[PDB]
Amino acid sequence: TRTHGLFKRLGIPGPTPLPLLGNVLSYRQGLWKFDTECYKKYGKMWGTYEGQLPVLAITDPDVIRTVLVKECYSVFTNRRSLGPVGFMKSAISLAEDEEWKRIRSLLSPTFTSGKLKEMFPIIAQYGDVLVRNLRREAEKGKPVTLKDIFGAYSMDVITGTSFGVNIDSLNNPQDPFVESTKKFLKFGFLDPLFLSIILFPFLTPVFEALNVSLFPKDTINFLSKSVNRMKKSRLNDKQKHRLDFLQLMIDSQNSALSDLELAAQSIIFIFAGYETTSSVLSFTLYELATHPDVQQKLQKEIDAVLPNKAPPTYDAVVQMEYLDMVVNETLRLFPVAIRLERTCKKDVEINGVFIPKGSMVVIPTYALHHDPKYWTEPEEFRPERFSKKKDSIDPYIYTPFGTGPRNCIGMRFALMNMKLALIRVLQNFSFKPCKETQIPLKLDTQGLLQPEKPIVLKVDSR
Ligand SMILES: CC(C)c1nc(CN(C)C(=O)N[C@H](C(=O)N[C@@H](Cc2ccccc2)C[C@H](O)[C@H](Cc2ccccc2)NC(=O)OCc2cncs2)C(C)C)cs1
Numbered sequence: 001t002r003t004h005g006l007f008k009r010l011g012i013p014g015p016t017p018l019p020l021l022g023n024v025l026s027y028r029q030g031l032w033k034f035d036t037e038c039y040k041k042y043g044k045m046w047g048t049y050e051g052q053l054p055v056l057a058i059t060d061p062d063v064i065r066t067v068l069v070k071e072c073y074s075v076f077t078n079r080r081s082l083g084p085v086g087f088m089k090s091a092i093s094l095a096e097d098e099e100w101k102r103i104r105s106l107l108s109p110t111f112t113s114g115k116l117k118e119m120f121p122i123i124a125q126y127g128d129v130l131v132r133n134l135r136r137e138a139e140k141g142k143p144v145t146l147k148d149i150f151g152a153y154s155m156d157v158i159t160g161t162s163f164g165v166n167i168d169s170l171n172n173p174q175d176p177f178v179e180s181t182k183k184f185l186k187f188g189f190l191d192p193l194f195l196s197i198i199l200f201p202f203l204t205p206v207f208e209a210l211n212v213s214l215f216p217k218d219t220i221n222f223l224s225k226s227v228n229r230m231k232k233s234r235l236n237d238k239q240k241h242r243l244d245f246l247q248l249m250i251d252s253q254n255s256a257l258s259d260l261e262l263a264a265q266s267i268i269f270i271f272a273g274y275e276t277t278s279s280v281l282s283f284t285l286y287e288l289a290t291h292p293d294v295q296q297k298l299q300k301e302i303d304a305v306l307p308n309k310a311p312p313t314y315d316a317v318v319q320m321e322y323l324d325m326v327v328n329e330t331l332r333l334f335p336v337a338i339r340l341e342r343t344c345k346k347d348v349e350i351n352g353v354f355i356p357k358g359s360m361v362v363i364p365t366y367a368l369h370h371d372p373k374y375w376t377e378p379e380e381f382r383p384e385r386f387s388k389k390k391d392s393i394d395p396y397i398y399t400p401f402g403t404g405p406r407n408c409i410g411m412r413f414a415l416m417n418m419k420l421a422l423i424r425v426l427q428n429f430s431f432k433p434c435k436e437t438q439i440p441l442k443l444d445t446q447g448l449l450q451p452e453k454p455i456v457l458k459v460d461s462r
Protein backbone atom coordinates (compact mmCIF):
# COMPACT_ATOMS: atom_id res chain seq x y z
CA THR A 1 0.00 0.00 0.00
CA ARG A 2 3.13 2.16 0.19
CA THR A 3 3.45 2.74 -3.56
CA HIS A 4 -0.22 2.11 -4.43
CA GLY A 5 -0.84 5.83 -5.02
CA LEU A 6 1.93 6.46 -7.54
CA PHE A 7 -0.15 6.20 -10.71
CA LYS A 8 -3.07 8.26 -9.41
CA ARG A 9 -0.38 10.75 -8.35
CA LEU A 10 0.66 11.04 -12.02
CA GLY A 11 -2.81 11.03 -13.56
CA ILE A 12 -2.19 7.63 -15.18
CA PRO A 13 -5.17 5.23 -15.52
CA GLY A 14 -5.17 1.62 -14.38
CA PRO A 15 -6.93 -0.99 -12.26
CA THR A 16 -7.32 -0.40 -8.54
CA PRO A 17 -4.61 -2.41 -6.75
CA LEU A 18 -5.38 -4.74 -3.88
CA PRO A 19 -3.52 -3.75 -0.68
CA LEU A 20 -0.99 -6.57 -0.43
CA LEU A 21 -1.14 -8.16 -3.88
CA GLY A 22 -1.48 -5.15 -6.17
CA ASN A 23 -2.91 -6.39 -9.46
CA VAL A 24 -1.28 -9.84 -9.47
CA LEU A 25 -4.65 -11.42 -8.69
CA SER A 26 -5.74 -10.34 -12.19
CA TYR A 27 -3.02 -12.54 -13.73
CA ARG A 28 -5.16 -15.62 -13.05
CA GLN A 29 -6.72 -15.41 -16.53
CA GLY A 30 -3.24 -15.19 -18.09
CA LEU A 31 -0.84 -12.27 -18.33
CA TRP A 32 -1.74 -12.02 -22.03
CA LYS A 33 -5.44 -11.65 -21.18
CA PHE A 34 -4.81 -9.03 -18.50
CA ASP A 35 -2.79 -6.88 -20.92
CA THR A 36 -5.53 -7.24 -23.55
CA GLU A 37 -8.33 -6.23 -21.16
CA CYS A 38 -6.27 -3.32 -19.84
CA TYR A 39 -5.45 -2.18 -23.38
CA LYS A 40 -9.12 -2.05 -24.38
CA LYS A 41 -10.26 -0.57 -21.05
CA TYR A 42 -7.52 2.06 -20.61
CA GLY A 43 -5.77 4.23 -23.16
CA LYS A 44 -2.30 4.05 -24.69
CA MET A 45 -0.72 3.97 -21.22
CA TRP A 46 -1.88 2.28 -18.02
CA GLY A 47 -0.29 1.44 -14.69
CA THR A 48 -0.47 -1.73 -12.60
CA TYR A 49 1.22 -3.00 -9.44
CA GLU A 50 2.96 -6.33 -8.88
CA GLY A 51 2.79 -6.18 -5.12
CA GLN A 52 4.65 -2.94 -4.43
CA LEU A 53 6.39 -2.78 -7.81
CA PRO A 54 4.82 -0.13 -10.09
CA VAL A 55 4.51 -1.25 -13.71
CA LEU A 56 3.90 1.24 -16.54
CA ALA A 57 2.53 -0.22 -19.78
CA ILE A 58 3.14 1.79 -22.96
CA THR A 59 1.70 1.30 -26.45
CA ASP A 60 2.71 4.47 -28.31
CA PRO A 61 5.28 3.42 -30.96
CA ASP A 62 7.09 6.72 -30.43
CA VAL A 63 7.35 6.02 -26.69
CA ILE A 64 8.28 2.36 -27.24
CA ARG A 65 11.13 3.52 -29.48
CA THR A 66 12.43 5.71 -26.65
CA VAL A 67 12.60 2.97 -24.02
CA LEU A 68 13.89 0.20 -26.30
CA VAL A 69 16.31 2.11 -28.55
CA LYS A 70 17.04 5.76 -27.80
CA GLU A 71 17.26 5.61 -23.98
CA CYS A 72 18.21 1.93 -23.68
CA TYR A 73 21.71 2.70 -22.40
CA SER A 74 20.54 5.92 -20.71
CA VAL A 75 17.86 4.36 -18.50
CA PHE A 76 16.23 1.12 -19.64
CA THR A 77 19.38 -1.00 -19.60
CA ASN A 78 18.16 -3.84 -17.37
CA ARG A 79 15.23 -6.18 -18.02
CA ARG A 80 13.89 -7.17 -14.60
CA SER A 81 15.38 -7.55 -11.12
CA LEU A 82 14.60 -11.20 -10.52
CA GLY A 83 14.34 -12.88 -7.14
CA PRO A 84 16.76 -15.36 -5.60
CA VAL A 85 18.59 -16.88 -8.57
CA GLY A 86 22.12 -17.58 -7.37
CA PHE A 87 24.97 -17.65 -9.89
CA MET A 88 22.37 -17.33 -12.70
CA LYS A 89 22.58 -13.58 -12.11
CA SER A 90 25.40 -13.54 -14.67
CA ALA A 91 23.24 -15.03 -17.43
CA ILE A 92 22.87 -12.66 -20.38
CA SER A 93 19.08 -12.40 -20.04
CA LEU A 94 19.52 -11.59 -16.32
CA ALA A 95 22.75 -9.56 -16.29
CA GLU A 96 22.74 -5.81 -15.64
CA ASP A 97 24.59 -2.66 -16.68
CA GLU A 98 28.25 -3.04 -17.74
CA GLU A 99 28.31 -6.77 -16.97
CA TRP A 100 25.55 -7.25 -19.54
CA LYS A 101 27.37 -5.19 -22.18
CA ARG A 102 30.42 -7.40 -21.66
CA ILE A 103 28.45 -10.66 -21.95
CA ARG A 104 26.44 -9.41 -24.93
CA SER A 105 29.53 -8.18 -26.79
CA LEU A 106 31.38 -11.45 -26.14
CA LEU A 107 28.43 -13.57 -27.32
CA SER A 108 27.41 -11.37 -30.27
CA PRO A 109 29.66 -13.12 -32.87
CA THR A 110 27.73 -16.36 -32.24
CA PHE A 111 25.16 -15.77 -34.98
CA THR A 112 26.75 -13.90 -37.89
CA SER A 113 25.71 -14.56 -41.48
CA GLY A 114 28.79 -16.74 -42.00
CA LYS A 115 28.32 -18.75 -38.81
CA LEU A 116 24.66 -19.33 -39.71
CA LYS A 117 25.84 -20.63 -43.10
CA GLU A 118 28.35 -23.03 -41.51
CA MET A 119 25.92 -24.65 -39.06
CA PHE A 120 23.30 -25.24 -41.77
CA PRO A 121 24.63 -28.75 -42.64
CA ILE A 122 24.45 -29.61 -38.94
CA ILE A 123 20.80 -28.52 -38.73
CA ALA A 124 19.92 -30.23 -42.02
CA GLN A 125 21.27 -33.55 -40.73
CA TYR A 126 18.99 -33.41 -37.67
CA GLY A 127 16.10 -32.64 -40.02
CA ASP A 128 16.74 -35.91 -41.84
CA VAL A 129 16.45 -37.73 -38.52
CA LEU A 130 13.31 -35.71 -37.81
CA VAL A 131 11.71 -36.87 -41.07
CA ARG A 132 12.82 -40.46 -40.45
CA ASN A 133 11.33 -40.64 -36.94
CA LEU A 134 8.14 -38.81 -37.95
CA ARG A 135 7.63 -41.36 -40.74
CA ARG A 136 7.46 -44.20 -38.20
CA GLU A 137 4.54 -42.56 -36.39
CA ALA A 138 2.82 -41.91 -39.74
CA GLU A 139 3.11 -45.45 -41.11
CA LYS A 140 1.76 -46.71 -37.78
CA GLY A 141 -1.19 -44.31 -38.04
CA LYS A 142 -0.83 -42.96 -34.48
CA PRO A 143 -1.33 -39.32 -33.46
CA VAL A 144 1.87 -37.35 -32.92
CA THR A 145 2.43 -35.17 -29.87
CA LEU A 146 4.17 -32.26 -31.58
CA LYS A 147 6.03 -30.95 -28.52
CA ASP A 148 7.77 -34.31 -28.04
CA ILE A 149 9.38 -35.04 -31.41
CA PHE A 150 9.86 -31.38 -32.34
CA GLY A 151 11.21 -30.75 -28.85
CA ALA A 152 13.78 -33.49 -29.39
CA TYR A 153 14.70 -31.90 -32.73
CA SER A 154 15.13 -28.48 -31.11
CA MET A 155 17.23 -29.90 -28.26
CA ASP A 156 19.41 -31.72 -30.79
CA VAL A 157 19.85 -28.60 -32.93
CA ILE A 158 20.79 -26.28 -30.07
CA THR A 159 23.28 -28.68 -28.47
CA GLY A 160 24.82 -29.70 -31.79
CA THR A 161 25.38 -26.15 -33.03
CA SER A 162 26.42 -24.61 -29.69
CA PHE A 163 28.59 -27.35 -28.15
CA GLY A 164 29.41 -29.55 -31.16
CA VAL A 165 27.98 -32.61 -29.38
CA ASN A 166 25.35 -35.06 -30.63
CA ILE A 167 23.28 -36.14 -27.62
CA ASP A 168 20.83 -37.92 -29.98
CA SER A 169 17.69 -36.59 -28.33
CA LEU A 170 15.61 -37.53 -31.38
CA ASN A 171 16.41 -41.22 -30.75
CA ASN A 172 16.32 -41.08 -26.93
CA PRO A 173 12.89 -41.63 -25.33
CA GLN A 174 14.35 -40.64 -21.94
CA ASP A 175 16.71 -37.86 -23.02
CA PRO A 176 18.15 -36.20 -19.89
CA PHE A 177 18.44 -32.73 -21.45
CA VAL A 178 14.74 -32.49 -22.33
CA GLU A 179 13.66 -33.89 -18.95
CA SER A 180 15.83 -31.30 -17.20
CA THR A 181 14.96 -28.33 -19.39
CA LYS A 182 11.18 -28.71 -19.37
CA LYS A 183 11.19 -28.13 -15.60
CA PHE A 184 11.70 -24.42 -16.26
CA LEU A 185 8.12 -24.24 -17.61
CA LYS A 186 6.36 -25.52 -14.48
CA PHE A 187 6.78 -22.42 -12.30
CA GLY A 188 3.96 -19.88 -12.44
CA PHE A 189 2.98 -16.52 -10.99
CA LEU A 190 0.91 -18.10 -8.18
CA ASP A 191 3.74 -20.38 -6.98
CA PRO A 192 4.33 -19.92 -3.22
CA LEU A 193 8.07 -19.26 -3.51
CA PHE A 194 7.69 -16.90 -6.47
CA LEU A 195 4.58 -15.20 -5.10
CA SER A 196 6.37 -14.43 -1.83
CA ILE A 197 9.14 -12.69 -3.79
CA ILE A 198 6.55 -10.54 -5.57
CA LEU A 199 4.71 -9.57 -2.39
CA PHE A 200 7.80 -9.33 -0.15
CA PRO A 201 10.78 -8.43 -2.36
CA PHE A 202 12.97 -8.06 0.75
CA LEU A 203 12.94 -11.88 0.98
CA THR A 204 15.23 -12.19 -2.06
CA PRO A 205 18.45 -11.55 -0.06
CA VAL A 206 17.12 -13.93 2.61
CA PHE A 207 16.63 -16.86 0.23
CA GLU A 208 19.96 -15.98 -1.40
CA ALA A 209 21.76 -16.41 1.93
CA LEU A 210 19.83 -19.67 2.40
CA ASN A 211 20.94 -20.83 -1.09
CA VAL A 212 17.36 -21.09 -2.39
CA SER A 213 16.76 -20.40 -6.08
CA LEU A 214 13.71 -19.82 -8.25
CA PHE A 215 15.30 -22.21 -10.76
CA PRO A 216 14.95 -26.01 -10.43
CA LYS A 217 18.16 -26.97 -8.68
CA ASP A 218 18.27 -30.47 -10.16
CA THR A 219 18.01 -28.97 -13.64
CA ILE A 220 20.57 -26.24 -12.91
CA ASN A 221 23.08 -28.75 -11.56
CA PHE A 222 22.65 -31.29 -14.37
CA LEU A 223 23.11 -28.69 -17.11
CA SER A 224 26.03 -27.00 -15.32
CA LYS A 225 27.72 -30.37 -14.79
CA SER A 226 26.91 -31.60 -18.30
CA VAL A 227 28.15 -28.38 -19.92
CA ASN A 228 31.35 -28.56 -17.87
CA ARG A 229 32.01 -32.02 -19.32
CA MET A 230 31.62 -30.75 -22.89
CA LYS A 231 34.04 -27.90 -22.14
CA LYS A 232 36.73 -30.13 -20.64
CA SER A 233 36.40 -32.52 -23.58
CA ARG A 234 36.85 -29.53 -25.90
CA LEU A 235 40.27 -28.63 -24.47
CA ASN A 236 41.72 -32.15 -24.40
CA ASP A 237 40.44 -32.84 -27.95
CA LYS A 238 41.85 -30.28 -30.39
CA GLN A 239 40.55 -32.21 -33.43
CA LYS A 240 36.95 -31.56 -32.32
CA HIS A 241 37.43 -27.78 -32.64
CA ARG A 242 34.74 -25.63 -34.26
CA LEU A 243 34.29 -21.87 -33.95
CA ASP A 244 30.90 -21.94 -32.23
CA PHE A 245 29.11 -20.78 -29.09
CA LEU A 246 30.98 -22.94 -26.57
CA GLN A 247 34.36 -22.17 -28.14
CA LEU A 248 33.67 -18.43 -28.08
CA MET A 249 33.30 -18.60 -24.30
CA ILE A 250 36.39 -20.79 -23.90
CA ASP A 251 38.47 -18.16 -25.71
CA SER A 252 37.20 -15.62 -23.17
CA GLN A 253 39.29 -17.20 -20.40
CA ASN A 254 42.57 -16.32 -22.15
CA SER A 255 42.22 -12.61 -21.23
CA ALA A 256 37.16 -13.05 -18.68
CA LEU A 257 34.33 -15.57 -18.30
CA SER A 258 34.01 -17.61 -15.11
CA ASP A 259 33.04 -21.28 -15.04
CA LEU A 260 29.76 -20.24 -13.42
CA GLU A 261 29.31 -17.42 -15.93
CA LEU A 262 29.94 -19.89 -18.76
CA ALA A 263 27.38 -22.27 -17.25
CA ALA A 264 24.86 -19.43 -16.91
CA GLN A 265 25.02 -18.51 -20.60
CA SER A 266 24.79 -22.17 -21.64
CA ILE A 267 21.60 -22.73 -19.63
CA ILE A 268 19.86 -19.80 -21.33
CA PHE A 269 20.82 -21.08 -24.79
CA ILE A 270 19.73 -24.66 -24.09
CA PHE A 271 16.37 -23.48 -22.74
CA ALA A 272 15.81 -20.92 -25.50
CA GLY A 273 16.90 -23.31 -28.26
CA TYR A 274 14.66 -26.10 -27.00
CA GLU A 275 11.50 -24.44 -25.69
CA THR A 276 10.89 -21.44 -27.96
CA THR A 277 11.76 -23.24 -31.21
CA SER A 278 9.56 -26.25 -30.45
CA SER A 279 6.68 -24.14 -29.10
CA VAL A 280 6.37 -21.88 -32.14
CA LEU A 281 6.81 -24.90 -34.43
CA SER A 282 3.91 -26.59 -32.63
CA PHE A 283 1.76 -23.50 -33.13
CA THR A 284 2.72 -23.21 -36.81
CA LEU A 285 1.78 -26.85 -37.41
CA TYR A 286 -1.43 -26.34 -35.43
CA GLU A 287 -2.38 -23.36 -37.60
CA LEU A 288 -1.45 -25.28 -40.76
CA ALA A 289 -3.56 -28.30 -39.81
CA THR A 290 -6.55 -26.09 -38.95
CA HIS A 291 -6.09 -24.08 -42.19
CA PRO A 292 -5.62 -26.68 -44.95
CA ASP A 293 -5.66 -24.04 -47.68
CA VAL A 294 -2.63 -22.37 -46.07
CA GLN A 295 -0.78 -25.68 -45.64
CA GLN A 296 -1.36 -26.91 -49.20
CA LYS A 297 -0.52 -23.44 -50.51
CA LEU A 298 2.67 -23.52 -48.42
CA GLN A 299 3.49 -26.97 -49.79
CA LYS A 300 2.92 -25.70 -53.34
CA GLU A 301 5.65 -23.11 -52.77
CA ILE A 302 8.03 -25.72 -51.33
CA ASP A 303 7.63 -28.22 -54.17
CA ALA A 304 8.34 -25.38 -56.61
CA VAL A 305 11.51 -24.04 -54.99
CA LEU A 306 12.73 -27.58 -54.13
CA PRO A 307 11.52 -29.94 -56.88
CA ASN A 308 11.37 -33.69 -56.16
CA LYS A 309 11.82 -33.32 -52.38
CA ALA A 310 15.24 -31.79 -53.00
CA PRO A 311 17.28 -31.08 -49.85
CA PRO A 312 17.00 -27.42 -48.86
CA THR A 313 19.77 -24.86 -49.10
CA TYR A 314 20.56 -21.91 -46.85
CA ASP A 315 19.56 -19.39 -49.52
CA ALA A 316 16.42 -21.33 -50.48
CA VAL A 317 15.31 -21.18 -46.84
CA VAL A 318 15.52 -17.36 -46.72
CA GLN A 319 14.01 -16.90 -50.19
CA MET A 320 10.63 -18.46 -49.45
CA GLU A 321 7.96 -15.76 -49.44
CA TYR A 322 4.97 -17.68 -48.09
CA LEU A 323 7.02 -19.64 -45.54
CA ASP A 324 8.26 -16.40 -43.97
CA MET A 325 4.65 -15.18 -43.91
CA VAL A 326 3.45 -18.34 -42.15
CA VAL A 327 6.14 -18.07 -39.46
CA ASN A 328 5.66 -14.33 -38.93
CA GLU A 329 1.91 -14.84 -38.53
CA THR A 330 2.42 -17.61 -35.98
CA LEU A 331 4.65 -15.25 -33.99
CA ARG A 332 1.90 -12.62 -34.18
CA LEU A 333 -0.78 -14.87 -32.67
CA PHE A 334 1.67 -16.55 -30.27
CA PRO A 335 4.49 -14.23 -29.19
CA VAL A 336 6.12 -16.49 -26.61
CA ALA A 337 7.19 -13.55 -24.42
CA ILE A 338 3.89 -11.89 -23.49
CA ARG A 339 5.61 -8.55 -22.90
CA LEU A 340 8.96 -6.82 -23.21
CA GLU A 341 10.27 -5.75 -19.81
CA ARG A 342 12.61 -2.89 -18.93
CA THR A 343 13.56 -1.45 -15.55
CA CYS A 344 14.16 2.24 -14.81
CA LYS A 345 17.81 2.54 -13.83
CA LYS A 346 17.18 6.11 -12.59
CA ASP A 347 14.27 8.53 -12.33
CA VAL A 348 13.03 9.45 -15.80
CA GLU A 349 10.12 11.18 -17.48
CA ILE A 350 8.83 8.81 -20.14
CA ASN A 351 5.70 10.31 -21.72
CA GLY A 352 5.68 13.48 -19.62
CA VAL A 353 5.04 11.88 -16.23
CA PHE A 354 8.08 11.31 -14.01
CA ILE A 355 8.67 7.62 -13.25
CA PRO A 356 10.67 6.76 -10.10
CA LYS A 357 13.83 4.67 -10.15
CA GLY A 358 13.25 0.92 -9.95
CA SER A 359 9.85 0.91 -11.65
CA MET A 360 9.20 -1.49 -14.51
CA VAL A 361 8.18 -0.45 -18.03
CA VAL A 362 6.30 -3.04 -20.08
CA ILE A 363 5.64 -3.26 -23.82
CA PRO A 364 2.57 -5.53 -24.10
CA THR A 365 3.71 -7.50 -27.15
CA TYR A 366 0.74 -9.87 -27.07
CA ALA A 367 -1.81 -7.06 -26.74
CA LEU A 368 -0.34 -5.04 -29.62
CA HIS A 369 -0.21 -8.22 -31.72
CA HIS A 370 -3.96 -8.70 -31.15
CA ASP A 371 -4.97 -5.05 -31.55
CA PRO A 372 -7.89 -4.69 -34.02
CA LYS A 373 -6.50 -1.24 -34.89
CA TYR A 374 -3.38 -2.77 -36.48
CA TRP A 375 -4.68 -6.20 -37.55
CA THR A 376 -8.09 -6.82 -39.11
CA GLU A 377 -9.75 -9.66 -37.17
CA PRO A 378 -6.64 -10.33 -35.06
CA GLU A 379 -7.69 -13.75 -33.75
CA GLU A 380 -7.67 -15.28 -37.25
CA PHE A 381 -4.67 -16.93 -38.90
CA ARG A 382 -3.96 -15.04 -42.14
CA PRO A 383 -0.35 -15.22 -43.38
CA GLU A 384 -1.46 -12.80 -46.12
CA ARG A 385 -1.16 -9.96 -43.59
CA PHE A 386 2.61 -10.25 -43.83
CA SER A 387 5.02 -10.26 -46.72
CA LYS A 388 8.69 -11.21 -46.62
CA LYS A 389 9.37 -7.48 -46.99
CA LYS A 390 8.62 -5.91 -43.60
CA ASP A 391 8.95 -2.28 -44.70
CA SER A 392 5.33 -1.51 -43.76
CA ILE A 393 5.42 -3.37 -40.43
CA ASP A 394 6.10 -1.05 -37.50
CA PRO A 395 9.21 -2.32 -35.64
CA TYR A 396 7.65 -1.29 -32.32
CA ILE A 397 4.14 -2.74 -32.69
CA TYR A 398 5.26 -6.14 -34.00
CA THR A 399 7.97 -7.17 -31.52
CA PRO A 400 8.20 -10.99 -31.38
CA PHE A 401 11.97 -10.75 -30.83
CA GLY A 402 12.07 -7.32 -29.20
CA THR A 403 13.93 -4.30 -30.54
CA GLY A 404 17.02 -2.40 -29.53
CA PRO A 405 20.31 -3.54 -28.02
CA ARG A 406 18.40 -5.95 -25.74
CA ASN A 407 16.56 -7.70 -28.57
CA CYS A 408 16.74 -11.46 -29.11
CA ILE A 409 20.35 -12.43 -29.77
CA GLY A 410 19.19 -15.63 -31.50
CA MET A 411 16.47 -14.40 -33.83
CA ARG A 412 18.19 -15.38 -37.08
CA PHE A 413 19.19 -18.76 -35.65
CA ALA A 414 15.64 -19.45 -34.44
CA LEU A 415 14.09 -18.48 -37.78
CA MET A 416 16.51 -20.68 -39.74
CA ASN A 417 16.03 -24.01 -37.97
CA MET A 418 12.27 -23.51 -37.67
CA LYS A 419 12.02 -22.94 -41.43
CA LEU A 420 14.35 -25.88 -42.10
CA ALA A 421 12.19 -28.18 -39.97
CA LEU A 422 8.99 -26.95 -41.63
CA ILE A 423 10.40 -27.34 -45.16
CA ARG A 424 11.65 -30.86 -44.46
CA VAL A 425 8.45 -32.11 -42.82
CA LEU A 426 6.02 -30.37 -45.19
CA GLN A 427 7.73 -31.70 -48.32
CA ASN A 428 7.25 -35.18 -46.80
CA PHE A 429 4.05 -34.92 -44.74
CA SER A 430 0.63 -33.30 -44.34
CA PHE A 431 -0.86 -32.46 -40.95
CA LYS A 432 -4.52 -32.95 -40.05
CA PRO A 433 -6.49 -32.36 -36.85
CA CYS A 434 -7.71 -35.48 -35.07
CA LYS A 435 -10.11 -36.39 -32.25
CA GLU A 436 -7.65 -35.38 -29.52
CA THR A 437 -6.93 -32.05 -31.24
CA GLN A 438 -8.21 -29.14 -29.15
CA ILE A 439 -10.06 -26.64 -31.36
CA PRO A 440 -10.12 -23.77 -30.67
CA LEU A 441 -6.70 -23.75 -29.00
CA LYS A 442 -6.89 -22.51 -25.41
CA LEU A 443 -3.82 -20.78 -23.98
CA ASP A 444 -2.42 -21.73 -20.59
CA THR A 445 -2.65 -19.22 -17.74
CA GLN A 446 0.89 -19.41 -16.30
CA GLY A 447 4.27 -18.31 -17.60
CA LEU A 448 5.20 -18.49 -21.28
CA LEU A 449 2.63 -19.01 -24.02
CA GLN A 450 1.69 -22.68 -23.89
CA PRO A 451 -1.35 -24.67 -25.01
CA GLU A 452 -3.70 -25.72 -22.23
CA LYS A 453 -3.45 -29.27 -23.61
CA PRO A 454 -0.48 -30.55 -25.66
CA ILE A 455 -0.94 -30.14 -29.41
CA VAL A 456 -1.48 -33.57 -30.98
CA LEU A 457 -2.00 -34.02 -34.72
CA LYS A 458 -2.22 -36.84 -37.25
CA VAL A 459 0.55 -37.02 -39.85
CA ASP A 460 0.34 -38.64 -43.29
CA SER A 461 2.81 -38.85 -46.16
CA ARG A 462 2.96 -36.48 -49.17
C1 LIG B 1 12.80 -18.84 -13.65
C2 LIG B 1 11.73 -19.82 -14.10
C3 LIG B 1 11.86 -21.17 -13.41
C4 LIG B 1 10.37 -19.25 -13.82
N1 LIG B 1 9.45 -19.18 -14.73
C5 LIG B 1 8.30 -18.59 -14.23
C6 LIG B 1 7.14 -18.37 -15.16
N2 LIG B 1 6.94 -16.93 -15.27
C7 LIG B 1 5.72 -16.39 -14.69
C8 LIG B 1 7.88 -16.17 -15.90
O1 LIG B 1 8.88 -16.67 -16.40
N3 LIG B 1 7.64 -14.84 -15.93
C9 LIG B 1 8.63 -13.84 -16.30
C10 LIG B 1 9.37 -14.12 -17.60
O2 LIG B 1 8.87 -14.83 -18.47
N4 LIG B 1 10.57 -13.53 -17.74
C11 LIG B 1 11.41 -13.69 -18.92
C12 LIG B 1 10.90 -12.80 -20.06
C13 LIG B 1 11.55 -13.09 -21.39
C14 LIG B 1 10.85 -13.75 -22.39
C15 LIG B 1 11.45 -14.03 -23.60
C16 LIG B 1 12.76 -13.67 -23.83
C17 LIG B 1 13.46 -13.01 -22.85
C18 LIG B 1 12.86 -12.72 -21.63
C19 LIG B 1 12.85 -13.31 -18.59
C20 LIG B 1 13.56 -14.22 -17.60
O3 LIG B 1 14.83 -13.65 -17.27
C21 LIG B 1 13.74 -15.65 -18.12
C22 LIG B 1 14.47 -16.46 -17.05
C23 LIG B 1 14.76 -17.89 -17.43
C24 LIG B 1 16.06 -18.32 -17.67
C25 LIG B 1 16.32 -19.63 -18.03
C26 LIG B 1 15.29 -20.53 -18.16
C27 LIG B 1 14.00 -20.12 -17.93
C28 LIG B 1 13.73 -18.81 -17.57
N5 LIG B 1 14.49 -15.70 -19.37
C29 LIG B 1 14.18 -16.56 -20.35
O4 LIG B 1 13.25 -17.33 -20.34
O5 LIG B 1 15.08 -16.48 -21.35
C30 LIG B 1 14.98 -17.49 -22.38
C31 LIG B 1 14.49 -16.92 -23.68
C32 LIG B 1 15.20 -16.23 -24.60
N6 LIG B 1 14.53 -15.85 -25.75
C33 LIG B 1 13.31 -16.27 -25.68
S1 LIG B 1 12.92 -17.11 -24.25
C34 LIG B 1 9.59 -13.51 -15.14
C35 LIG B 1 8.83 -13.13 -13.88
C36 LIG B 1 10.59 -14.63 -14.84
C37 LIG B 1 8.37 -18.23 -12.93
S2 LIG B 1 9.91 -18.60 -12.28
Ligand code: HEM
Binds near residue numbers: 410
Ligand atom coordinates in the same frame (compact mmCIF):
# COMPACT_ATOMS: atom_id res chain seq x y z
C1 HEM C 1 10.93 -18.40 -31.95
C2 HEM C 1 12.07 -18.23 -31.27
C3 HEM C 1 12.38 -17.08 -30.28
C4 HEM C 1 11.63 -16.01 -29.94
C5 HEM C 1 10.27 -15.60 -30.44
C6 HEM C 1 12.38 -15.24 -28.96
C7 HEM C 1 11.95 -14.06 -28.36
C8 HEM C 1 12.71 -13.24 -27.55
C9 HEM C 1 12.28 -11.99 -26.95
C10 HEM C 1 10.92 -11.37 -27.11
C11 HEM C 1 13.30 -11.50 -26.24
C12 HEM C 1 13.31 -10.19 -25.43
C13 HEM C 1 13.55 -9.02 -26.38
C14 HEM C 1 13.68 -7.74 -25.61
O1 HEM C 1 13.71 -7.79 -24.35
O2 HEM C 1 13.76 -6.65 -26.24
C15 HEM C 1 14.42 -12.42 -26.36
C16 HEM C 1 15.66 -12.28 -25.78
C17 HEM C 1 16.70 -13.18 -25.86
N1 HEM C 1 16.74 -14.29 -26.68
FE1 HEM C 1 15.17 -15.10 -27.71
N2 HEM C 1 13.57 -15.88 -28.72
C18 HEM C 1 13.61 -17.01 -29.52
C19 HEM C 1 14.64 -17.92 -29.57
C20 HEM C 1 15.90 -17.76 -29.03
C21 HEM C 1 17.04 -18.65 -29.21
C22 HEM C 1 16.98 -19.90 -30.04
C23 HEM C 1 18.07 -18.14 -28.52
C24 HEM C 1 19.52 -18.66 -28.35
C25 HEM C 1 20.01 -19.77 -28.91
C26 HEM C 1 17.62 -16.91 -27.88
C27 HEM C 1 18.38 -16.09 -27.08
C28 HEM C 1 17.95 -14.93 -26.46
C29 HEM C 1 18.69 -14.17 -25.47
C30 HEM C 1 20.05 -14.53 -24.95
C31 HEM C 1 17.94 -13.13 -25.11
C32 HEM C 1 18.32 -12.04 -24.08
C33 HEM C 1 19.30 -11.06 -24.72
C34 HEM C 1 19.62 -9.94 -23.76
O3 HEM C 1 18.94 -9.83 -22.71
O4 HEM C 1 20.56 -9.14 -24.05
N3 HEM C 1 16.30 -16.72 -28.22
N4 HEM C 1 14.02 -13.47 -27.17
